[PDB]
Design an enzyme around this catalytic site. Structure first.
Site, mmCIF file in Angstrom:
data_model
loop_
_atom_site.group_PDB
_atom_site.id
_atom_site.type_symbol
_atom_site.label_atom_id
_atom_site.label_comp_id
_atom_site.label_asym_id
_atom_site.label_seq_id
_atom_site.Cartn_x
_atom_site.Cartn_y
_atom_site.Cartn_z
ATOM 1 N N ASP A 55 35.785 45.136 32.726
ATOM 2 C CA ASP A 55 34.331 45.092 32.894
ATOM 3 C C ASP A 55 33.921 45.026 34.362
ATOM 4 O OD1 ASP A 55 35.336 42.465 33.024
ATOM 5 O OD2 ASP A 55 33.719 41.571 31.819
ATOM 6 N N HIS A 56 34.868 44.832 35.281
ATOM 7 C CA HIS A 56 34.635 45.041 36.704
ATOM 8 C C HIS A 56 35.315 46.326 37.145
ATOM 9 C CE1 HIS A 56 33.496 40.705 37.808
ATOM 10 N NE2 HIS A 56 33.826 40.660 36.526
ATOM 11 N N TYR A 93 39.051 34.056 42.656
ATOM 12 C CA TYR A 93 38.317 34.221 41.405
ATOM 13 C C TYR A 93 37.465 32.959 41.283
ATOM 14 C CZ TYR A 93 37.118 34.354 36.514
ATOM 15 O OH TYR A 93 36.431 34.297 35.328
ATOM 16 N N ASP A 128 40.430 41.577 34.128
ATOM 17 C CA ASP A 128 40.164 41.053 32.781
ATOM 18 C C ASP A 128 41.422 41.019 31.922
ATOM 19 O OD1 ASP A 128 38.480 39.898 30.847
ATOM 20 O OD2 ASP A 128 38.370 41.811 29.779
ATOM 21 N N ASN A 172 31.541 35.833 41.627
ATOM 22 C CA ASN A 172 30.696 35.385 40.509
ATOM 23 C C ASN A 172 29.301 34.971 40.968
ATOM 24 O OD1 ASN A 172 31.453 35.607 37.757
ATOM 25 N ND2 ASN A 172 33.306 34.414 38.231
ATOM 26 N N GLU A 180 41.541 37.318 37.470
ATOM 27 C CA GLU A 180 41.622 37.179 36.016
ATOM 28 C C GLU A 180 42.856 37.889 35.471
ATOM 29 O OE1 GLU A 180 38.456 37.071 33.096
ATOM 30 O OE2 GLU A 180 37.078 37.241 34.799
ATOM 31 N N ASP A 207 31.644 41.418 43.241
ATOM 32 C CA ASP A 207 32.919 41.560 43.921
ATOM 33 C C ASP A 207 32.660 41.990 45.357
ATOM 34 O OD1 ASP A 207 33.316 42.455 40.848
ATOM 35 O OD2 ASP A 207 35.165 41.479 41.541
ATOM 36 N N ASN A 220 38.940 42.530 39.624
ATOM 37 C CA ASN A 220 39.013 41.645 38.467
ATOM 38 C C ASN A 220 39.443 42.495 37.279
ATOM 39 O OD1 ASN A 220 38.274 40.390 35.985
ATOM 40 N ND2 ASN A 220 36.940 38.959 37.088
ATOM 41 N N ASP A 263 36.283 38.335 43.091
ATOM 42 C CA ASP A 263 35.144 38.176 42.198
ATOM 43 C C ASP A 263 34.540 36.823 42.546
ATOM 44 O OD1 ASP A 263 33.345 37.691 40.136
ATOM 45 O OD2 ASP A 263 34.836 37.959 38.540
HETATM 46 MG MG LIG Z 1 36.915 38.408 31.664
#
Ligand SMILES: [Mg+2]
Length: 275
Positions: A265-266, A128, A27, A169, A53, A240, A25, A167
């Protein structure tokens, strides 16, 4: 309290790994580049790279991707309404036999979340998964997504062995996040999301590759909030995954968490198969 162990590049039977899949991911594809995410991909040299993402279309891609050698087959999916959110990509050294988009359900196919790539002996899905949102505003929609995705993957896995990565989530169990108690009513650790993940593993069935190999290993996360220096403190979540049809477990060499790779951030995750 976590250092990912060295790469195990032979199977349980001593066969060498031959297929390397990386999932990340990012971002935002463009921010990820500015944050030097692409330099890392060049070092990792995966055979297949799955990105979540992207926040990008197939219509507005950066030109660096066109010069990534070793990943020349590139497939992209972005939302059907606005751009700048969600979006996934799948980049492959080898051409897949077939590439499709979404999960065959118009309700769930408008946000650029899933690419399906069929290969010789397996089918790769990258996803995602919809975040349940601040205040869980999207939790009911996420429950609908979970059921439709589960049913879609069960049908997919009936015809060919499956690798699902991305990801997802959700942190499945308490071991999958640093602060379980404080997050049981926050996106990623609700009972609804965790039960959906458990049902996904049982229904398809799929095995959680990392937890299969490292059933008792704590503090192993793939996401940390940007704020409050969470990543430096390893206050994280494992969101993930590589989920595998059971018939791929004899080919599983390792499932890695690339904790030190920056750009998002991943962090990336990497799968080694002897296939
Ligand atoms: Mg994000």
């Amino acid at each position: 309290l976590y250092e990912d162990p060295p790469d195990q590049k032979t199977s349980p039977s001593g066969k060498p790994a031959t297929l390397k899949i990386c999932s990340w991911n990012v971002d935002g594809l463009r921010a990820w580049i500015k944050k030097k995410g692409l330099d890392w991909v060049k070092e990792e040299a995966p055979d297949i790279l799955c990105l979540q993402e992207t926040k990008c279309s197939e219509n507005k891609l950066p030109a660096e991707l066109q010069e990534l050698p070793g990943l020349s087959h590139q497939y992209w999916s972005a939302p059907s309404d606005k751009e700048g959110y969600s979006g996934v990509g799948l980049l492959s050294r080898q051409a897949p036999l077939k590439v499709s988009y979404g999960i065959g359900d118009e309700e769930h196919d408008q946000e650029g979340r899933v690419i399906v790539a069929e290969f010789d002996s397996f089918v790769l899905v990258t996803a995602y998964v919809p975040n349940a949102g601040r205040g869980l505003v999207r939790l009911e929609y996420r429950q609908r997504w979970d059921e439709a995705f589960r049913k879609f993957l069960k049908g997919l896995a009936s015809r060919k062995p499956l690798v699902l990565c991305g990801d997802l989530n959700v942190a499945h169990e308490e071991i999958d996040l640093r602060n379980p108690k404080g997050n049981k009513k926050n996106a990623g650790f609700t009972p609804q999301e965790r039960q959906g993940f458990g049902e996904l593993l049982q229904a398809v069935p799929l095995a959680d590759s990392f937890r299969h190999l490292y059933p008792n290993t704590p503090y192993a996360y793939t996401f940390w909030t940007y704020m409050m220096n969470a990543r430096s403190k390893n206050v994280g979540w494992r969101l993930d995954y590589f989920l595998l049809s059971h018939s791929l477990l004899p080919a599983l060499c390792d499932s890695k968490i690339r904790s030190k790779a920056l750009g998002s951030d991943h962090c990336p995750i990497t799968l080694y198969l002897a296939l």
